[PDB]
Amino acid sequence: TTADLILINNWYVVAKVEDCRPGSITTAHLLGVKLVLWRSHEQNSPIQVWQDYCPHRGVPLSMGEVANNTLVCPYHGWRYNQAGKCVQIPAHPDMVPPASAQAKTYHCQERYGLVWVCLGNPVNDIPSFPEWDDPNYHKTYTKSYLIQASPFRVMDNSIDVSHFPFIHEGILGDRNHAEVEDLEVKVDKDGLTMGKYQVHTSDSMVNWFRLSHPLCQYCSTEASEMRTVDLMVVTPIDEDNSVLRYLIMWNGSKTLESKILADYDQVIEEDIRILHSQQPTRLPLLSGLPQEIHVPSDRCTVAYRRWLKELGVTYGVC
Amino acid sequence: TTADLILINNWYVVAKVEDCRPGSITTAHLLGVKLVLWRSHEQNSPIQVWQDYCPHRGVPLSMGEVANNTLVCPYHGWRYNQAGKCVQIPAHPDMVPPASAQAKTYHCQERYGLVWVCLGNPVNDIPSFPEWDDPNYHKTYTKSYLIQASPFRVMDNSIDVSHFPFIHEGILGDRNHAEVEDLEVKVDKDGLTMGKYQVHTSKFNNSTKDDSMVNWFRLSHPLCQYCSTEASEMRTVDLMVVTPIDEDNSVLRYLIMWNGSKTLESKILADYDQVIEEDIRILHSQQPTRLPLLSGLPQEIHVPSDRCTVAYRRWLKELGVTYGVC
Amino acid sequence: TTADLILINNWYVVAKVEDCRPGSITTAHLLGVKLVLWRSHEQNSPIQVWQDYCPHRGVPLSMGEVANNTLVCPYHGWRYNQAGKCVQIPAHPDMVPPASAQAKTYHCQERYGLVWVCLGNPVNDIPSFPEWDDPNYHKTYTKSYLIQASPFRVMDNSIDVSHFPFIHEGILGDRNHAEVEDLEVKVDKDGLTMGKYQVHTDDSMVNWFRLSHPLCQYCSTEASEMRTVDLMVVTPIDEDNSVLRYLIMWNGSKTLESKILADYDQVIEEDIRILHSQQPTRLPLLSPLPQEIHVPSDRCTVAYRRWLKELGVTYGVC
Numbered sequence: 001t002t003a004d005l006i007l008i009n010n011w012y013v014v015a016k017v018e019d020c021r022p023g024s025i026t027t028a029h030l031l032g033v034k035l036v037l038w039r040s041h042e043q044n045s046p047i048q049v050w051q052d053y054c055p056h057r058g059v060p061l062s063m064g065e066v067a068n069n070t071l072v073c074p075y076h077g078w079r080y081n082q083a084g085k086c087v088q089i090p091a092h093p094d095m096v097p098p099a100s101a102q103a104k105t106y107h108c109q110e111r112y113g114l115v116w117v118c119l120g121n122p123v124n125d126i127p128s129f130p131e132w133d134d135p136n137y138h139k140t141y142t143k144s145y146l147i148q149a150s151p152f153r154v155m156d157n158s159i160d161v162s163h164f165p166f167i168h169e170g171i172l173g174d175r176n177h178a179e180v181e182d183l184e185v186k187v188d189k190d191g192l193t194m195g196k197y198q199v200h201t202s203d204s205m206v207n208w209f210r211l212s213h214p215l216c217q218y219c220s221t222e223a224s225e226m227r228t229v230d231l232m233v234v235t236p237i238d239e240d241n242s243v244l245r246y247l248i249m250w251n252g253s254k255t256l257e258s259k260i261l262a263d264y265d266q267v268i269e270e271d272i273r274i275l276h277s278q279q280p281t282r283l284p285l286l287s288g289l290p291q292e293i294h295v296p297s298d299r300c301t302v303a304y305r306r307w308l309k310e311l312g313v314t315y316g317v318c
Numbered sequence: 319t320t321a322d323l324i325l326i327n328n329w330y331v332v333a334k335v336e337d338c339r340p341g342s343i344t345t346a347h348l349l350g351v352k353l354v355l356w357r358s359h360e361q362n363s364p365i366q367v368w369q370d371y372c373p374h375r376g377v378p379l380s381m382g383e384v385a386n387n388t389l390v391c392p393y394h395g396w397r398y399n400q401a402g403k404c405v406q407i408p409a410h411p412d413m414v415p416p417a418s419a420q421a422k423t424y425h426c427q428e429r430y431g432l433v434w435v436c437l438g439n440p441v442n443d444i445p446s447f448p449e450w451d452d453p454n455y456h457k458t459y460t461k462s463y464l465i466q467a468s469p470f471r472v473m474d475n476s477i478d479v480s481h482f483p484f485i486h487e488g489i490l491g492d493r494n495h496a497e498v499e500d501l502e503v504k505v506d507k508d509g510l511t512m513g514k515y516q517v518h519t520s521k522f523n524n525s526t527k528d529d530s531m532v533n534w535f536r537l538s539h540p541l542c543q544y545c546s547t548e549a550s551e552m553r554t555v556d557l558m559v560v561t562p563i564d565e566d567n568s569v570l571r572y573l574i575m576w577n578g579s580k581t582l583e584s585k586i587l588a589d590y591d592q593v594i595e596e597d598i599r600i601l602h603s604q605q606p607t608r609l610p611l612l613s614g615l616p617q618e619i620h621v622p623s624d625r626c627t628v629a630y631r632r633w634l635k636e637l638g639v640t641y642g643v644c
Numbered sequence: 645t646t647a648d649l650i651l652i653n654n655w656y657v658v659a660k661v662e663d664c665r666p667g668s669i670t671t672a673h674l675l676g677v678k679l680v681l682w683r684s685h686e687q688n689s690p691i692q693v694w695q696d697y698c699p700h701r702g703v704p705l706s707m708g709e710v711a712n713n714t715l716v717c718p719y720h721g722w723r724y725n726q727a728g729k730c731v732q733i734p735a736h737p738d739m740v741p742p743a744s745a746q747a748k749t750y751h752c753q754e755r756y757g758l759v760w761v762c763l764g765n766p767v768n769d770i771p772s773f774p775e776w777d778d779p780n781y782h783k784t785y786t787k788s789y790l791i792q793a794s795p796f797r798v799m800d801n802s803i804d805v806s807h808f809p810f811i812h813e814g815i816l817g818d819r820n821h822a823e824v825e826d827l828e829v830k831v832d833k834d835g836l837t838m839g840k841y842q843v844h845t846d847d848s849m850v851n852w853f854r855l856s857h858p859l860c861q862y863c864s865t866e867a868s869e870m871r872t873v874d875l876m877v878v879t880p881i882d883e884d885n886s887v888l889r890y891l892i893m894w895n896g897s898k899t900l901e902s903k904i905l906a907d908y909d910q911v912i913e914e915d916i917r918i919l920h921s922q923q924p925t926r927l928p929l930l931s932p933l934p935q936e937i938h939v940p941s942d943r944c945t946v947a948y949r950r951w952l953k954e955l956g957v958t959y960g961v962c
């Protein structure tokens with residue numbers, strides 16, 4: 001991977017736990033690295049997340065099979081244990097496999113029902129999500145959305161609030177209330193925080209959000225009769241491509257789940273129409289030819305660009 | 319755009335006027351640039367031609383809407399007046415938009431029912447088409463042909479006459495009458511001219527006399543050709559316009575006028591379409607894509623019947639064209 | 645072309661003679677060069693192999709037609725004789741074509757029912773195939789296989805024997821017999837030879853093979869008094885793409901032919917599954933994604949990589 005160290009050392013969601021069943025092999029793609037995810041058939045077995053590559057002759061291990069707590073390459077049958085060490089070369093069954101016979105392994109943790117991966121050296125914890133432990137809140141997951149846009153443009157779009165009346169009219173916006181009041185934004189060691197903001201839907205909700213790290217956002221909305229939170233997680237496939245997922249929790253009736261998912265789906269697809277059209281693909285930082293213009297209601301998206309530059313992000317941006 | 323200045327400062331057709339209704343938003347591409355063409359809902363409203371790009375967050379303005387004689391970006395609703403100046407930012411409705419909030423605008427003229435665009439500073443006039451105002455002549459437009467070939471190879475193939483008996487058997491030639499007489503070619507202050515040339519066509523109607531077509535053409539600029547043909551009963555002229563999408567891709571259109579019966583329009587359009595598609599089969603195949611000028615594949619060979627296509631290549635070098643050529 | 649002179653000056657198969665009937669026009673691609681193959685309508689006419697290019701206005705001659713003993717370009721009807729000389733320019737029927745009016749022609753020989761081409765100046769003869777002349781041997785031909793992999797990776801995969809029990813189980817091995825004996829490998833002026841080797845399916849066969857040149861392999865298998873030999877010929881389309889063909893001869897029953905053809909098709913498709921997945925695309929050579937690992941049963945594929953470097957191959961390898 002050629003991503004910046006600041007990106008390499010963070011945790012990213014790559015899958016839902018429910019999709020990584022015992023005995024299964026699945027794949028993902030993170031910061032330009034192809035990943036294989038596997039579990040032994042044993043109940044409660046851990047998830048291994050490795051680079052999807054057999055170092056013998058360069059075959060994807062995801063093309064193999066899980067047997068007896070090992071992942072077995074399809075080409076010459078080399079067997080790799082849970083730690084990624086080759087323990088058996090069938091052509092030479094009494095030989096001790098060379099030390100180089102070892103899959104590239106990465107850090108993996110399950111949290112909030114999601115599979116989190118760190119390709120580097122974890123310097124931080126997985127982002128917090130306080131309502132996960134609050135049994136007054138129900139939970140639901142959106143499907144995943146594959147987006148042909150930089151992961152930082154994806155997050156930029158979700159920090160933006162002034163677009164609501166124009167592409168989310170009815171759910172998040174009112175074309176008769178397109179004015180945007182003064183925004184409160186802070187960037188510090190807790191990350192990027194937008195203060196409480198009044199949303200007009202054509203009722204009136206109060207919204208705020210925080211990003212402790214650049215590609216995960218915690219979003220909180222209070223309506224009249226209900227509070228809705230979510231954890232937005234962007235998988236940075238590479239500089240130009242993203243996966244998007246939401247874990248949503250709410251303290252109203254359980255029966256609202258389908259309507260919530262439907263509203264999110266409508267809004268997300270409205271945003272994707274814009275995201276797929278933006279040029280340049282990578283997010284421009286502060287300094288397809290004219291440079292970006294910023295107005296006061298861009299205060300939070302300007303702060304996001306400033307934050308990325310302070311962090312040293314060069315991957316997925318321009 | 320890496321196009322040469324001599325190309326940037328010229329006029330090119332990007333659309334037919336009749337396909338650009340009031341209130342409409344049309345996309346096109348020219349010399350590597352993405353364009354948006356829009357009109358207000360007022361009748362006889364002019365056509366604006368701008369780079370298709372909102373300078374706020376980089377969204378195509380063509381994804382927006384036309385309202386109150388402005389083009390409105392879909393993302394945050396900034397409204398751009400006919401001059402391309404942002405006159406309204408909805409998030410801050412009492413704020414004067416910054417002077418930088420301005421679309422890149424280009425020159426547009428309507429002429430002969432065609433939308434002409436100049437991306438630079440118009441040195442030249444739009445090419446002349448004398449029959450346009452002659453009521454003895456009817457008019458028709460071909461469809462637009464999208465061609466995966468350099469615009470200069472598209473025009474090279476229209477200047478070429480010796481191919482007629484081989485890929486246009488019937489409408490423009492016959493394979494047993496393939497010899498090419500000496501050609502009159504001039505490159506001068508009027509551009510490139512091929513003088514009157516006898517075209518030998520295959521007979522179709524056995525009751526009638528030979529067609530005995532005499533053709534000539536002139537290019538005052540390198541991607542527009544004025545073509546004139548006298549046949550047995552009538553004169554047919556056309557204006558051929560090549561849109562240089564980029565170095566390797568072209569749109570081709572003809573405006574055709576004739577002083578015979580209006581009822582011939584179907585035969586004319588079908589004959590043009592048959593010939594054009596025969597030419598496209600060759601154009602798509604030619605390598606290198608870009609037109610070789612005079613100087614790993616071997617060099618082009620030239621014979622006497624290539625006099626006008628050689629002259630075209632020499633003219634392009636004189637003009638300084640480097641874009642779409644090699 | 646950017647291919648090495650050592651590759652340019654060798655012979656490659658580009659077609660089966662059965663693919664090129666009298667009067668036909670066919671295309672092929674070799675070392676980056678587009679080829680046209682044509683024959684006059686006469687009985688037993690020779691095959692011309694030229695660069696697929698009319699030097700007048702750059703049209704592929706393969707879009708033309710064969711007329712008399714000439715290939716006629718579709719655009720302006722220039723006529724090229726069997727030597728590639730333009731003999732008629734129809735616009736100027738009494739004019740002697742300029743000397744430059746000439747197709748680029750290549751060396752071509754038919755041998756073993758295959759069309760061999762040398763783009764350069766051939767320093768070697770076409771490889772030997774002793775059984776061709778033996779009336780005790782029947783012959784058959786596989787179809788041609790277009791493979792999105794380097795021609796040197798295709799040949800590497802056919803030199804590899806330890807993969808037999810894992811991707812060719814039931815034809816060339818089985819997983820209960822995966823151990824690989826000490827291999828006999830020699831590289832000298834004859835090229836690369838693998839000495840006789842036991843193949844499992846007693847239930848066993850004896851195999852050996854030899855490459856006089858890097859992209860053609862002679863292979864010999866004996867089992868139950870029947871012998872099967874083949875000539876494997878790889879067409880190096882460019883650095884990343886190959887055509888694969890086999891000429892097979894055997895001295896058992898004629899009725900084995902469809903079974904032989906079916907077995908080869910299964911094995912080849914089993915190999916293509918692996919070949920298409922391998923990264924990098926080009927064959928990695930030895931060094932003086934992690935680097936390849938080599939174990940004793942890789943002795944002959946290691947020797948292949950060593951040979952290619954010693955020959956100075958840079959095209960299709962890394």
Ligand SMILES: N=C1N[C@H]2[C@H](COC(N)=O)NC(=N)N3CC[C@H](O)[C@]23N1
Binds near residue numbers: 157158232246265268
């Ligand atoms: N973390 C985030 N979740 C999304 C949900 C969408 O809400 C609904 N109801 O669809 N809520 C919200 N205010 N936004 C604004 C940007 C993005 O759509 C999002 N950010």
Ligand SMILES: N=C1N[C@H]2[C@H](COC(N)=O)NC(=N)N3CC[C@H](O)[C@]23N1
Binds near residue numbers: 475489533558590594
């Ligand atoms: N400006 C041009 N219009 C075309 C028409 C086609 O006429 C018909 N009847 O199909 N006439 C003509 N002589 N040619 C030669 C090249 C190209 O097809 C063209 N040039």
Ligand SMILES: N=C1N[C@H]2[C@H](COC(N)=O)NC(=N)N3CC[C@H](O)[C@]23N1
Binds near residue numbers: 803861874875876909
């Ligand atoms: N020259 C070669 N021909 C092929 C045939 C395949 O045999 C069958 N029966 O399909 N025989 C053989 N031993 N191999 C090993 C590699 C490659 O499949 C091949 N090499």
Ligand code: FES
Binds near residue numbers: 055056
């Ligand atoms: S490539 Fe994986 S065992 Fe050989």
Ligand code: FES
Binds near residue numbers: 372373394395
């Ligand atoms: S991107 Fe056009 S108004 Fe914001």
Ligand code: FES
Binds near residue numbers: 698699702703718
């Ligand atoms: S391009 Fe082949 S004869 Fe003109």
Ligand SMILES: [Cl-]
Binds near residue numbers: 041066
């Ligand atoms: Cl297991």
Ligand SMILES: [Cl-]
Binds near residue numbers: 137138139140
């Ligand atoms: Cl729940």
Ligand SMILES: [Cl-]
Binds near residue numbers: 006010213311
């Ligand atoms: Cl961070």
Ligand SMILES: [Cl-]
Binds near residue numbers: 010011
């Ligand atoms: Cl993050």
Ligand SMILES: [Cl-]
Binds near residue numbers: 341358384387388
């Ligand atoms: Cl309007």
Ligand SMILES: [Cl-]
Binds near residue numbers: 410411412413
């Ligand atoms: Cl305001």
Ligand SMILES: [Cl-]
Binds near residue numbers: 650654857
């Ligand atoms: Cl050699």
Ligand SMILES: [Fe+3]
Binds near residue numbers: 163168267271
């Ligand atoms: Fe949105």
Ligand SMILES: [Fe+3]
Binds near residue numbers: 475486597
């Ligand atoms: Fe033509």
Ligand SMILES: [Fe+3]
Binds near residue numbers: 801802807812911915
């Ligand atoms: Fe194999």
